[PDB]
């Protein structure tokens, strides 16, 4: 609700999408590059 | 049959406990005299006029010192570069006052270390070894002769030589910083890279052998007892440690050759200390390191400070305080 | 007298008789085996294994 | 009491590792004495 | 089978650079510590924090450039880009010295992520993990100098800046103000660094000089195939050499190569303990028996009391320009000069 | 009185160097 | 594909004969157009000192440090 | 193998050894707690560092009641 | 594909060297 | 196909044009103390 | 002091002469290859 | 003036750990003489 | 005022001879465990 | 060297004689301490 | 400082009395 508290939760959301776009890209490519049995 | 041949057969015998050799004919008398005078001069030796201003600096244990502060003091500024043996001193009391035993220890040290180096050659000849361990030992011989011999020569006095002690070493390093700026000199830079690199590749090679040891013991006894001495089987999977470091950085940065690997461990430090010991040598003749003081200016022309200007103000503090009574004139030419 | 320009530091005459009797006392030992040998015997090696 | 422990082992120290551990203590005694006496 | 197994099989696949699980912590954080240093030494100045020039835009070469520590007014703030100091602005973040904590924090999570890399590769190859334990040595020097040393001090300002000459003043700042060379923890650290460089120069030069004849060529590097079971150098000869030269020698290759691990690493752990004791200003500054005697007897001089007068020159002369935040205005007449210098 | 301890540490260190060189456990093949 | 087989191929040097000068000149123009002084806030040689401020500028506040650097960079 | 009276009471606490829940189990419940406890440590550090300012929370030596 | 592995390190490096050659010709 | 030693030649003298350019601007421009 | 000095030049050129006449004593032939 | 508790620090810092390392060597040689079964086992 | 060399007299008069008598007992039990041949001889 | 000595023996000290010799030293340490501290 | 040594000698003496009574080498027939 302050300047410092509102900016921190926005960084927490921004810290979620940085983990997110790495994770979402990693699941999709792990489907295509599976190893033959 | 002759007396000389029965003496050459003994002095070059590898069947002795310690190989003596022909270099030991002048290694052992030199280093035992450098030793037996060092133990006496470190324990019981009166104070020494080092600055030549008749202000005697205590350096031994009986005159109130410890392991850290006690030191064999270098010879006087009054003597300087002159050879000062015992018989050219008219009493031992006049010898010990003016920095006597610093020249007796150092000159019998540099002869005994340059003979210990040739002795490492000689036994490699008589044992069938390829010869060049003594070339690797040239790197501390270069550095010992740089601070005890070459730096007193170019500065013109043994009083600028290195004090044989522990606190005397740091008196030597700091005064050498203010007067020569060794840290900016690229040969101290090339040997910090020699011993940081040397301690890297030591602990990097010693870990990859110890990582890939083969099972020869149980979990109760020691790891080291899986090596029987003189065995002919290889004691670690070298393909395993190659595949590890071949994935830890990348594939092409790994030595599969163990001979070229064990050569690079000998190259990197020794070349780093050859280059460094010729940093003290070229700074013995006042060819100092870099000097970037007042190098960055604005368009107005005012000096903008850098990190070298902060480093300069540390050098100016040691320069105006070293040998605080010995100077009389505005420039430390010595 | 330190900075005198005297040969091998030989200040007095007595120190010469020390030097000559040091090199010669071992030279005479050395000639007891390697002296009185044939000075005319060669080899086409890099290194000679002639005798004691 | 109860029975004898099957986890009894023996302790070893060869002559090599004696001289390491002696020299380790004396060199640490040389180094740290000057500071302790102050 | 599952979703976790497909991701586990993809990361551990043989490829050019091994990624693994630990590459998700290493490769983002190490790329930004390195790139944060190359940017900060090229573009970002130190004109507002220290009052220096530490960039390539400002004429500094490779030696006098640095990523510099922030101001003393910042204190120990983490200086987040979104934080209360920078407030989202990139340009004001760089001028306060925000890249330095950016380098140090993402660098500290690179050394975490690189040591986890050495546990992961050793488990897949199937070896003992002594590389990851010897690398804990350099972790204890980064943490206890770049992190634990400014935390005990007044702010991040008293930390080493990431530049070549900026380390060099930190070497000089630590002698005058702390007497770091007198500390027995540096003395046990120099014994490991110069002792570790000693061991690889000997083991380098003894293996290479007891080699066997495995070929007719004069080059001995050619005569080694990697998958051979015969040892390539005579251990019995090398023992017989050093037992007569030096008097005592290794008779155990397993003990030898372990001893090449113990000596360099312990010098980084023992020297790391002392620098934690200088965050608290618990320095080995004086021998009081030397100091009480030199006060009562104005003739007693050692080399040790000579080093204190060299430290008054470091404490007085550089501290005016060292700490511009404190505004030391020294007169000319308080600065300790010697005679005629 | 103080320097007597320093001397005993130094010559005591040189004792265990003497015993390590001459009374070493001599390694043997087989 | 082996690395040394790539850089000796012609098709490699077809692509990277355009991309390297188009990226090196963009690193030139990033400096010569005066853009790098404004992104990173580095002083030009004209503007270390000003007409008013003749001393060394320092930040002297924890929280208004952004506002104080708005002061010291206008003149 | 010596039955004691205190050993008889505690015996059902040690009688299980190595029974597991088959599968992934309550592992995704744990990570949501660990993600939460990571955010908790970040917040109370930034309060302490004065890099996260909360209204009517001042990190300074306060008058405890005497 | 390894085009993302090299060019994350080489595309910056040529860009900064485009700036370091420009700073040699900048004067006061 | 290009011979590999031609590649190391052209890139190798390209580095010398980069390095000696950096030692040039130690004596001119900024940081030269002129 | 001129009595000590005599004693040193004895001891120096005793061991220096053992060094000089050591390598003149067919010293390359003293190897483990042959003789 | 030196601290008189430093004599107790050094001389017990020498003797107590160094006499410890002697004991691990004496019982090592006793076990080797114990198994060997000749003239010294008892 | 006490004599500060008495701390060194007593605490080495305790420890040095008492640590001696411990060593003769440990090597006694090691020889007995050395001959016995089971689980501890090695 | 020469051959192995046939006069090698073994030293014994049972658990009984340990406690005698420990108590002998501590009681002599209790008795003579007060005089040494003076 | 002086009485600390006397106390350590007394309770140290009572330790070896404790170990001699309870950890005694129990004598056995045959
Ligand atoms: C091992 C492997 C490790 C792996 C590497 C991991 C790396 C992760 C990086 C760690 C991040 C740590 C930095 C956090 C910032 C910091 O520390 O920030 C420091 C702040 C403390 O803030 C400081 O607090 C001080 C105390 O002030 C207080 O007191 C003053 C006088 O009393 C005034 O009253 C003032 O108003 C009042 O606030 C001053 O105010 C300083 O200016 C202010 O910066 O604490 C904090 O955030 C947290 C401190 C509490 C946690 C303690 C652990 C961390 C500190 C360890 C060091 C302890 C010191 C020992 C030295 C050795
Ligand atoms: C995985 C790699 C990694 C790691 C470990 C870090 C670590 C760090 N970075 Mg960094 N960073 C990274 C990658 C990484 N970074 C990348 C790729 C970039 C480029 C964009 C940056 C850019 C960057 C900047 C610009 C800054 C940092 C900063 C920081 C530090 C503080 C950040 C903080 O407080 O976290 C807060 C965030 C978290 C604790 C994340 C927690 C996530 C929780 C568990 C889940 C959140 C879910 C959420 C509530 C719901 C989301 C919903 C949505 C997904 C739909 C910290 C050391 C700051 C710094 O060091 O200042 C000096 C800073 O200014 N980083
Ligand atoms: C004979 C001289 C000598 C020697 C051998 C040493 C030895 C040592 N000193 Mg010392 N010192 C000396 C003289 C000496 N000192 C003198 C005269 C002074 C002046 C008073 C000092 C002042 C001094 C200080 C002030 C400090 C030391 C420290 C140290 C230790 C070095 C720390 C280290 O290994 O860093 C090696 C570096 C690391 C381990 C950091 C980690 C390295 C990372 C992993 C590298 C990652 C790079 C990565 C690949 C990315 C690179 C690419 C990128 C660039 C693009 C070591 C014990 C330091 C210390 O004690 O620290 C504990 C320390 O702080 N010394
Ligand atoms: C798509 C989006 C979002 C856009 C953004 C773009 C983007 C994705 C960018 C990200 C890309 C990114 C930055 C990734 C790159 C990854 C990367 C490389 C990051 C790390 C950063 C970095 C600074 C790395 C460089 C540092 C590095 C690792 C250097 C390696 C050093 C090196 C080559 C050392 C070799 C030393 C050496 C010769 C050692 C051998 C000698 C030695 C004694 C070893 C011991 C030994 C060796 C053996 O061999 C064997 C046998 C045995 C017995 C043995 O004892
Ligand atoms: C007597 C007088 C008057 C003395 C006064 C002296 C004085 C002024 C003070 C000195 C006091 C003093 C000694 C202070 C030291 C204090 C100090 C620095 C303490 C260090 C203490 C310590 C705990 C340090 C921690 C770091 C540490 C563990 C370092 C150890 C360094 C060290 C011992 C390294 C060993 C070096 C060593 C000699 C190795 C070479 C081994 C060698 C013979 C190789 C043999 C060999 C090699 C092969 O490769 C192969 C293949 C074979 C087969 C083989 O055999
Ligand atoms: C394909 C992938 C390639 C991977 C690239 C990986 C990135 C790592 C590269 C690290 C380089 C870090 C060195 C920076 C040097 C710099 O740019 O100086 C560039 C500076 C810029 O030059 C300065 O420019 C200023 C402009 O105002 C002034 O004019 C100064 O006078 C002038 O010196 O040049 C120097 O300082 C001259 C000497 C350069 C010495 C550099 C070598 C020093 C040894 C470091 C070796 C690093 C090894 C890297 C191995 C890779
Ligand atoms: C087995 C070995 C047994 C010996 C142990 C050897 C340890 C030696 C080091 C400790 C003794 C040195 C103390 C100086 C001697 C002296 O006289 O002091 C004497 C001082 C006491 O000081 C005396 O006090 C008296 C009243 O209290 C009077 O005031 C005296 O004037 C005053 O001198 O004793 C100590 O300071 C003992 C402190 C020991 C505890 C150490 C605390 C610090 C530990 C930190 C741990 C960090 C470790 C991290 C890992 C590294
Ligand atoms: C293994 C054990 C190692 C410890 C040995 C234990 C022996 C302890 C008893 C001796 C120490 C007690 C001395 C008091 C301590 C003290 O501070 O003194 C300290 C005094 C020295 O006195 C100090 O001297 C200094 C300058 O010399 C200053 O003057 C000091 O002020 C002064 O106190 O030391 C002694 O007196 C040591 C004497 C030891 C020799 C004993 C001589 C008598 C022997 C007679 C033998 C008869 C035996 C017949 C059989 C019975
Ligand atoms: C500036 C960069 C530093 C030098 C750059 C190159 C490194 C040296 C490479 C050639 C080394 C020569 C070479 O490779 O020899 C390797 C040599 C064994 O070589 P081989 O006998 O197989 O063959 C070498 C010769 O015999 C000819 O084949 O190993 C040693 O004996 C190591 C023991 C000495 C250890 C210290 C060696 C330090 C010497 C290095 C100084 C050399 C300067 C001259 C260079 C020719
Ligand atoms: C005139 C020249 C004649 C030679 C001079 C003799 C001086 C030689 C010094 C003896 C080293 C004794 C240390 C025992 C060490 C000991 O006995 O180790 C014995 C050890 C033999 O290990 P092994 O392979 O037998 O061990 C296999 C397993 O049993 C491991 O336990 O040899 C080494 O590893 C020593 C190599 C490092 C040598 C460390 C030397 C450090 C230098 C000395 C530091 C003290 C100087 C303090 C002065 C104040
Ligand atoms: C900061 C930051 C960032 C960024 C990051 C990155 C992306 C970076 C990168 C960067 C990089 C990564 C950089 C690089 C650089 C490089 C360089 C610039 C190099 C140079 C080089 C040189 C100069 C060298 C030299 C040489 C040669 C060439 C050869 C011979 C040898 C020698 C060594 C001499 C971001 C966005 C996150 C945001 C936040 C902050
Ligand atoms: O004598 Mn020893 O230090 Ca070489 O600089 Mn000049 O001289 Mn003295 O002053 Mn500074
Ligand atoms: Fe090796």
mmCIF file of N, CA, C and O and ligand atoms in Angstrom, chain B residues 130-133 135-136 259 262-263 266-267 270-271 274-275, chain E residues 201 204-206 208-209 211 217-222, ligand 9:
data_model
loop_
_atom_site.group_PDB
_atom_site.id
_atom_site.type_symbol
_atom_site.label_atom_id
_atom_site.label_comp_id
_atom_site.label_asym_id
_atom_site.label_seq_id
_atom_site.Cartn_x
_atom_site.Cartn_y
_atom_site.Cartn_z
ATOM 1 N N UNK B 130 65.604 -38.429 -16.426
ATOM 2 C CA UNK B 130 65.646 -37.222 -17.231
ATOM 3 C C UNK B 130 65.854 -36.035 -16.298
ATOM 4 O O UNK B 130 65.372 -36.053 -15.167
ATOM 5 N N UNK B 131 66.590 -35.017 -16.709
ATOM 6 C CA UNK B 131 67.377 -34.272 -15.725
ATOM 7 C C UNK B 131 66.732 -33.077 -15.044
ATOM 8 O O UNK B 131 67.321 -32.570 -14.092
ATOM 9 N N UNK B 132 65.553 -32.617 -15.460
ATOM 10 C CA UNK B 132 65.209 -31.209 -15.306
ATOM 11 C C UNK B 132 64.339 -30.892 -14.103
ATOM 12 O O UNK B 132 63.519 -29.977 -14.179
ATOM 13 N N UNK B 133 64.501 -31.594 -12.989
ATOM 14 C CA UNK B 133 63.879 -31.089 -11.776
ATOM 15 C C UNK B 133 64.577 -29.815 -11.331
ATOM 16 O O UNK B 133 63.932 -28.893 -10.832
ATOM 17 N N UNK B 135 65.684 -27.409 -13.087
ATOM 18 C CA UNK B 135 65.183 -26.246 -13.802
ATOM 19 C C UNK B 135 63.911 -25.711 -13.153
ATOM 20 O O UNK B 135 63.677 -24.502 -13.146
ATOM 21 N N UNK B 136 63.098 -26.586 -12.564
ATOM 22 C CA UNK B 136 61.939 -26.114 -11.822
ATOM 23 C C UNK B 136 62.357 -25.457 -10.523
ATOM 24 O O UNK B 136 61.689 -24.538 -10.047
ATOM 25 N N UNK B 259 50.676 -37.013 -19.571
ATOM 26 C CA UNK B 259 52.014 -36.456 -19.588
ATOM 27 C C UNK B 259 51.966 -34.969 -19.871
ATOM 28 O O UNK B 259 52.628 -34.181 -19.192
ATOM 29 N N UNK B 262 50.600 -33.420 -16.635
ATOM 30 C CA UNK B 262 51.645 -33.237 -15.642
ATOM 31 C C UNK B 262 52.785 -32.371 -16.124
ATOM 32 O O UNK B 262 53.711 -32.160 -15.359
ATOM 33 N N UNK B 263 52.798 -31.905 -17.361
ATOM 34 C CA UNK B 263 53.761 -30.884 -17.732
ATOM 35 C C UNK B 263 53.232 -29.492 -17.488
ATOM 36 O O UNK B 263 53.987 -28.619 -17.059
ATOM 37 N N UNK B 266 53.879 -28.112 -14.180
ATOM 38 C CA UNK B 266 55.223 -27.611 -13.964
ATOM 39 C C UNK B 266 55.507 -26.342 -14.739
ATOM 40 O O UNK B 266 56.378 -25.575 -14.336
ATOM 41 N N UNK B 267 54.796 -26.106 -15.836
ATOM 42 C CA UNK B 267 55.009 -24.905 -16.629
ATOM 43 C C UNK B 267 54.518 -23.672 -15.896
ATOM 44 O O UNK B 267 55.305 -22.771 -15.610
ATOM 45 N N UNK B 270 56.267 -22.130 -12.541
ATOM 46 C CA UNK B 270 57.691 -21.883 -12.722
ATOM 47 C C UNK B 270 57.919 -20.741 -13.694
ATOM 48 O O UNK B 270 58.749 -19.863 -13.448
ATOM 49 N N UNK B 271 57.143 -20.690 -14.775
ATOM 50 C CA UNK B 271 57.204 -19.539 -15.662
ATOM 51 C C UNK B 271 56.675 -18.301 -14.953
ATOM 52 O O UNK B 271 57.182 -17.196 -15.157
ATOM 53 N N UNK B 274 59.721 -17.232 -12.631
ATOM 54 C CA UNK B 274 60.803 -16.663 -13.425
ATOM 55 C C UNK B 274 60.499 -15.228 -13.807
ATOM 56 O O UNK B 274 61.349 -14.352 -13.680
ATOM 57 N N UNK B 275 59.276 -14.975 -14.256
ATOM 58 C CA UNK B 275 58.890 -13.645 -14.701
ATOM 59 C C UNK B 275 58.806 -12.685 -13.525
ATOM 60 O O UNK B 275 59.202 -11.521 -13.627
ATOM 61 N N UNK E 201 54.476 -27.621 -8.707
ATOM 62 C CA UNK E 201 55.729 -27.460 -9.428
ATOM 63 C C UNK E 201 56.653 -28.642 -9.194
ATOM 64 O O UNK E 201 57.501 -28.941 -10.034
ATOM 65 N N UNK E 204 54.677 -31.717 -10.867
ATOM 66 C CA UNK E 204 54.823 -31.539 -12.290
ATOM 67 C C UNK E 204 56.190 -31.958 -12.788
ATOM 68 O O UNK E 204 56.310 -32.621 -13.816
ATOM 69 N N UNK E 205 57.232 -31.594 -12.057
ATOM 70 C CA UNK E 205 58.588 -31.810 -12.517
ATOM 71 C C UNK E 205 59.163 -33.151 -12.105
ATOM 72 O O UNK E 205 60.257 -33.488 -12.551
ATOM 73 N N UNK E 206 58.477 -33.924 -11.276
ATOM 74 C CA UNK E 206 58.972 -35.244 -10.931
ATOM 75 C C UNK E 206 58.318 -36.330 -11.759
ATOM 76 O O UNK E 206 58.981 -37.307 -12.106
ATOM 77 N N UNK E 208 57.321 -35.744 -14.802
ATOM 78 C CA UNK E 208 57.823 -35.533 -16.149
ATOM 79 C C UNK E 208 59.295 -35.932 -16.260
ATOM 80 O O UNK E 208 59.831 -36.068 -17.363
ATOM 81 N N UNK E 209 59.954 -36.182 -15.137
ATOM 82 C CA UNK E 209 61.351 -36.580 -15.169
ATOM 83 C C UNK E 209 61.606 -37.994 -14.687
ATOM 84 O O UNK E 209 62.762 -38.352 -14.484
ATOM 85 N N UNK E 211 59.698 -40.526 -16.402
ATOM 86 C CA UNK E 211 58.835 -41.179 -17.370
ATOM 87 C C UNK E 211 59.483 -42.446 -17.889
ATOM 88 O O UNK E 211 60.702 -42.588 -17.856
ATOM 89 N N UNK E 217 60.619 -41.955 -30.245
ATOM 90 C CA UNK E 217 60.722 -40.533 -30.537
ATOM 91 C C UNK E 217 61.318 -39.790 -29.354
ATOM 92 O O UNK E 217 61.273 -40.260 -28.216
ATOM 93 N N UNK E 218 61.893 -38.619 -29.630
ATOM 94 C CA UNK E 218 62.444 -37.804 -28.554
ATOM 95 C C UNK E 218 61.340 -37.082 -27.799
ATOM 96 O O UNK E 218 61.503 -36.744 -26.623
ATOM 97 N N UNK E 219 60.215 -36.831 -28.460
ATOM 98 C CA UNK E 219 59.063 -36.255 -27.788
ATOM 99 C C UNK E 219 58.395 -37.304 -26.914
ATOM 100 O O UNK E 219 57.959 -38.351 -27.395
ATOM 101 N N UNK E 220 58.299 -37.023 -25.621
ATOM 102 C CA UNK E 220 57.666 -37.954 -24.705
ATOM 103 C C UNK E 220 56.177 -37.723 -24.547
ATOM 104 O O UNK E 220 55.511 -38.539 -23.910
ATOM 105 N N UNK E 221 55.635 -36.646 -25.109
ATOM 106 C CA UNK E 221 54.206 -36.393 -24.990
ATOM 107 C C UNK E 221 53.410 -37.328 -25.880
ATOM 108 O O UNK E 221 52.231 -37.592 -25.625
ATOM 109 N N UNK E 222 54.045 -37.850 -26.926
ATOM 110 C CA UNK E 222 53.338 -38.678 -27.889
ATOM 111 C C UNK E 222 53.079 -40.073 -27.342
ATOM 112 O O UNK E 222 52.170 -40.770 -27.805
HETATM 113 C C1 LIG P 9 55.878 -16.671 -22.623
HETATM 114 C C2 LIG P 9 55.161 -17.998 -22.637
HETATM 115 C C3 LIG P 9 55.942 -19.067 -21.898
HETATM 116 C C4 LIG P 9 56.734 -20.026 -22.747
HETATM 117 C C5 LIG P 9 55.806 -20.555 -23.812
HETATM 118 C C6 LIG P 9 55.919 -22.019 -24.099
HETATM 119 C C7 LIG P 9 56.106 -22.891 -22.907
HETATM 120 C C8 LIG P 9 57.343 -23.750 -22.910
HETATM 121 C C9 LIG P 9 57.140 -24.744 -24.024
HETATM 122 C C10 LIG P 9 58.337 -25.555 -24.461
HETATM 123 C C11 LIG P 9 58.835 -26.202 -23.185
HETATM 124 C C12 LIG P 9 59.817 -27.319 -23.341
HETATM 125 C C13 LIG P 9 59.207 -28.662 -23.216
HETATM 126 O O1 LIG P 9 58.041 -28.748 -23.474
HETATM 127 O O2 LIG P 9 59.774 -29.627 -22.456
HETATM 128 C C14 LIG P 9 58.899 -30.622 -21.934
HETATM 129 C C15 LIG P 9 59.788 -31.478 -21.087
HETATM 130 C C16 LIG P 9 59.783 -32.916 -21.575
HETATM 131 O O3 LIG P 9 59.894 -32.788 -22.955
HETATM 132 P P1 LIG P 9 60.517 -34.014 -23.856
HETATM 133 O O4 LIG P 9 61.833 -34.389 -23.308
HETATM 134 O O5 LIG P 9 59.314 -34.787 -24.231
HETATM 135 O O6 LIG P 9 60.913 -33.082 -25.085
HETATM 136 C C17 LIG P 9 61.359 -31.774 -24.864
HETATM 137 C C18 LIG P 9 62.679 -31.832 -25.551
HETATM 138 O O7 LIG P 9 63.314 -32.992 -25.075
HETATM 139 C C19 LIG P 9 62.556 -31.865 -27.037
HETATM 140 O O8 LIG P 9 61.512 -32.754 -27.386
HETATM 141 O O9 LIG P 9 59.248 -31.465 -19.797
HETATM 142 C C20 LIG P 9 60.137 -31.098 -18.878
HETATM 143 O O10 LIG P 9 61.157 -31.666 -18.790
HETATM 144 C C21 LIG P 9 59.514 -30.448 -17.749
HETATM 145 C C22 LIG P 9 60.565 -30.227 -16.701
HETATM 146 C C23 LIG P 9 61.043 -28.805 -16.714
HETATM 147 C C24 LIG P 9 59.884 -28.077 -16.115
HETATM 148 C C25 LIG P 9 60.083 -26.605 -16.284
HETATM 149 C C26 LIG P 9 59.914 -26.237 -17.749
HETATM 150 C C27 LIG P 9 59.931 -24.739 -17.962
HETATM 151 C C28 LIG P 9 60.666 -24.457 -19.270
HETATM 152 C C29 LIG P 9 59.880 -23.443 -20.064
HETATM 153 C C30 LIG P 9 60.744 -22.284 -20.545
HETATM 154 C C31 LIG P 9 60.696 -22.442 -22.033
HETATM 155 C C32 LIG P 9 60.917 -21.190 -22.833
HETATM 156 C C33 LIG P 9 61.338 -21.754 -24.178
HETATM 157 C C34 LIG P 9 60.157 -22.205 -24.966
HETATM 158 C C35 LIG P 9 60.636 -23.128 -26.060
#
